[PDB]
Amino acid sequence: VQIINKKLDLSNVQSKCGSKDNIKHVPGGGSVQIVYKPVDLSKVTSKCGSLGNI
Amino acid sequence: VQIINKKLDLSNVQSKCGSKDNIKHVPGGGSVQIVYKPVDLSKVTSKCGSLGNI
Amino acid sequence: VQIINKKLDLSNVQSKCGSKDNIKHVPGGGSVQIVYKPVDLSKVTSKCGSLGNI
């Protein structure tokens, strides 16, 4: 009758960033959301010799 | 009767960014969402020797 | 009577970005969504020697 997970995670990420969504998840009736002139200018640089497992 | 997951994750990502969606998931009746002149100018550079497993 | 998943993930991605969808999932009746002059000018550079498994 069990639920069994047994999860093993050895995954690798060098550089990780979340989302940059503008307007997101609005249940609010009659509400107003404005995002005015948003800009993403970010620089991400990742340099690696070996990235992995085993 | 079991539910058995047994997940093994050795996955690799060098650079990871989330989504950049403008307007997303609006259940709100009569609501207003404006994203006005959104811009993505971002730069992603990824350099690797070996990326992998085994 | 079981459910069994048994997933093994060895996947590799060098550079990963999510979606950039403009308007997405609107159950809200009578609502207004405007994305006005959206722009993507972003740059992705990926360089690898060896990418794989085994």
Residue numbers in the entry:
A (entry chain A), B (entry chain B), C (entry chain C): 275 to 328
Which sentences from the paper describe this structure?
Abundant filamentous inclusions of tau are characteristic of more than 20 neurodegenerative diseases that are collectively termed tauopathies. Six tau isoforms that range from 352 to 441 amino acids in length are expressed in adult human brain from a single gene by alternative mRNA splicing. Tau filaments consist of a structured core made mostly of the repeat domain, with less structured N- and C-terminal regions forming the fuzzy coat. Here, we report in vitro assembly conditions with recombinant tau that replicate the structures of filaments from both Alzheimer’s disease (AD) and chronic traumatic encephalopathy (CTE), as determined by cryo-EM.
The structures were nearly identical at residues 288–322, with an all-atom r.m.s.d. of 1.5 Å, (filament type 38a). It is possible that the absence of a non-proteinaceous co-factor, which was hypothesised to be present inside the GGT fold, precluded formation of bona fide GGT filaments. Addition of heparan sulphate or phosphoglycerate to the assembly buffer did not result in formation of the GGT fold (filament types 39–41). Further experiments are needed to identify the co-factor of GGT. With the exception of the reconstruction for filament type 47a, which showed backbone oxygen atoms indicative of a right-handed filament, all reconstructions of filaments with previously unobserved protofilament folds with resolutions beyond 2.9 Å (i.e. filament types 12a, 27a 38a, 40a, 44a, 45a, and 47a) showed backbone oxygen densities indicative of left-handed filaments. Filament type 39a is the same fold as filament type 40a, which at 2.3 Å resolution was shown to be left-handed.
